[PDB]
Design a protein around this ligand. Structure first.
Ligand SMILES: [Cl-]
Ligand SMILES: [Cl-]
Ligand SMILES: [Cl-]
Ligand SMILES: [Cl-]
Ligand SMILES: [Cl-]
Ligand SMILES: [Cl-]
Lengths: 240, 242
């Protein structure tokens, strides 16, 4: 590597090994063609030591992005920055606030997808909370997934095939693609039932998958598969 | 004259559930302290929020609260507050300061959701009584690991001169939110807070400082400030502990 334009590179800090929350940021950086370093994936990485450093603006948890001497944490907050700085969101306030709330709603769904298998405690193993997971999964499948998906289906009721009227994808379109990917992995049977209800959502999902901007990244070693992150396939939690 | 007047159509419309302070309280504190005219529409006789939300078609809210302001319908508590911070100076004027306040608010929102999920760990739509056994388990973790982690975080975020979360030289909306989440925890987990509060002198100083703001005096003593009950912050003795 070591080519000139990488002097502008942002530092992204998020766990190696799973897509996780970091994936929402990474999708925007890749599609936006914004130079960055995936610091925790580098051989001599020390995210432990980096995150405990004295900062004026300390991250509570990953992901965080270091840009212009700023340390920016919270997935939606990092993307808000990229939206304004790199044009991944509308130019006007109304548009940016719309994209921000969409991203926050996507983050809500994403958290629910994690909490389905960790309903008692993020810090306890799934195995010790499986009985609770079975109960929470029934609600998540029966009420939560349709509610969120109907909402995004209605958000997409506009000319041009994106979440906004900006005439191109926003970072929220990328994030919506990703949460659908996550749900397809974690709940394949339930999605099989539900996808027919949401043709605009599934057209959006398909359209992002085929973006020229993302072709390279999605086929690359930088795109990690799902596993034991947010979106986990436990067949006992799935259902028609 | 003393009283700030406004003509028809000037007030923002805040739409949030009546009965509980809930998520709407974070917005209400900022509008009140910032002296931004607003109507708490869902509390007014004859108004129907569920009806109002149905018609909201260009930028529909997923759920309350939402704010109808300056031609926009703005939803998500942190998003509503982001607008107020930028347009009414309730957050720093600079980019880095705004991003800092926004992440602090989102972190406050994480803690707030966890305070709700302690008693609704299975489903927001099901009654507490039907998921009480699960709640006991979730509560043990929330008290033991989560509450101190968030509180320590805010204690460190406050380690700067000036007695606020930012370097702007005054309270921001995240400072008001931080006061409110501490009020909520004091109500819901009084025994655990008895153990914890001594650890966080800057946080408790912040809490007391906001409580005393002359711009909040009227509001906090008014009928407009609803007490906690069966909203987000709920006092269940069985979920509390040292
Ligand atoms: Cl994941
Ligand atoms: Cl269990
Ligand atoms: Cl409440
Ligand atoms: Cl609307
Ligand atoms: Cl139970
Ligand atoms: Cl102690």
């Amino acid at each position: 590597e070591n080519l000139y334009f990488q002097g502008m590179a942002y530092d992204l800090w998020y766990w190696d090994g799973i897509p996780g929350r970091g994936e929402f940021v990474r999708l925007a950086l890749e599609a936006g063609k914004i130079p960055y370093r995936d610091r925790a994936r580098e051989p001599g990485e020390d995210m432990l030591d980096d995150m405990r450093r004295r900062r004026d603006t300390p991250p509570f948890a990953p992901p965080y992005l270091v840009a212009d001497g700023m340390t920016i944490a919270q997935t939606a907050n990092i993307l808000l920055f990229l939206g304004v700085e790199h044009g991944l969101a509308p130019p006007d306030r109304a548009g940016r606030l719309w994209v921000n709330q969409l991203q926050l709603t996507i983050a809500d769904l994403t958290a629910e997808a994690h909490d389905v298998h960790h309903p008692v405690a993020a810090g306890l193993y799934y195995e010790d909370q499986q009985d609770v997971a079975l109960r929470r999964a029934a609600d998540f499948r029966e009420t939560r997934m349709p509610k969120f998906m109907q909402y995004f289906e209605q958000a997409l009721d506009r000319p041009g095939g994106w979440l906004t009227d900006m005439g191109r994808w926003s970072y929220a379109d990328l994030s919506l693609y990703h949460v659908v990917e996550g749900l397809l992995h974690a709940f394949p049977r339930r999605m099989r039932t539900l996808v027919h209800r949401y043709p605009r959502l599934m057209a959006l999902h398909a359209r992002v998958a085929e973006l020229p901007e993302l072709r390279g990244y999605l086929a690359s070693d930088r795109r990690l598969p799902f596993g034991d992150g947010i979106f986990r396939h436990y067949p006992e939690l799935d259902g028609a």
